Amino acid sequence: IRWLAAPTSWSWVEQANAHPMEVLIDHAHCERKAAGAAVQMMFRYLCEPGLGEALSPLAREELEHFEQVLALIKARGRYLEPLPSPGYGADLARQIRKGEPQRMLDSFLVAGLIEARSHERMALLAEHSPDPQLRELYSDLLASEARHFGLYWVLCEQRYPRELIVERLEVLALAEVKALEGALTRPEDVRMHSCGVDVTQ
Template structure:
């Protein structure tokens, strides 16, 4: 599991080229309701992404059997997070999204089968970053109820990016998958590089990573 170290550095997980910065965690703790609302949006988008890929590759053997349960679980998480948002007197308000998802989407190549490979890897990278940041919140969130929430989601988040990896390995040579993952992981870090001018704009995937070593 990703953990915050005593010297305020963050241990990374295998998929990610650089860990989340301490500043992101501080911003998150200072704006937990906005983060929670954004998290609900993220779960909704993750479900939609899985469904979109399932229908794009409708006749791909073994794909729907993996993506349908992912989509259903993401919607369960959406319901769970939305209930907490409503409990705190808020609702699923529109929030300005960071450029993270759009930048990763632009990195997906157009022609097949490269498009399928990149789609799986980008989805997996987003799940991996979500897992990493949820692990930080599970360990260090100042709100006990949210610490419990994020602790409860870690297993499924880890399983999701593992499933996207397996979808790749079942269809392409491991060396090819690993090489492309390394390229996309650099793009993922670039999408999170920078500083947040307004801390209240913190999102689950807003900027805040350590430099690539």
């Protein structure tokens, strides 16, 4: 399974290296939002077999990551700030169809795409950050993020015919790329999911 339809632009890596704390603060918010989305999915699908078993530990792990990143934020002299989120999240949310069974499928695939893009960008910072502490943080988070997009795939595969999943993911993956197109307005506007994608392939 290939989740993402295009890689992040080196432009984003440069911007993230220039304003690491804005990325880090946004990242803490992203982990908490991921936990929240998992809990909201569980409420929507209250008694769905297997779902609580899968999403409850995921939400806990996302909260652990939130707490870990928050501790580093404070070790670097800052706190959680209300940095406005990029348009990415809302752009992806808009792709989720109303009505079951399409809604569940779209919800899992959107969550998985967001996780895959976070993993892809964290992998870039793990290698390219000039700060060893940040390389270590981001490296430490990679394995778990890969388990998370893996989980969202498995949740689809358990409930839906495979080609339905593949076809919808292709559509959503192109929307995810469109959601990252554009140029950053100001250096301090960089975020985990701010603009910067290479569409040339």
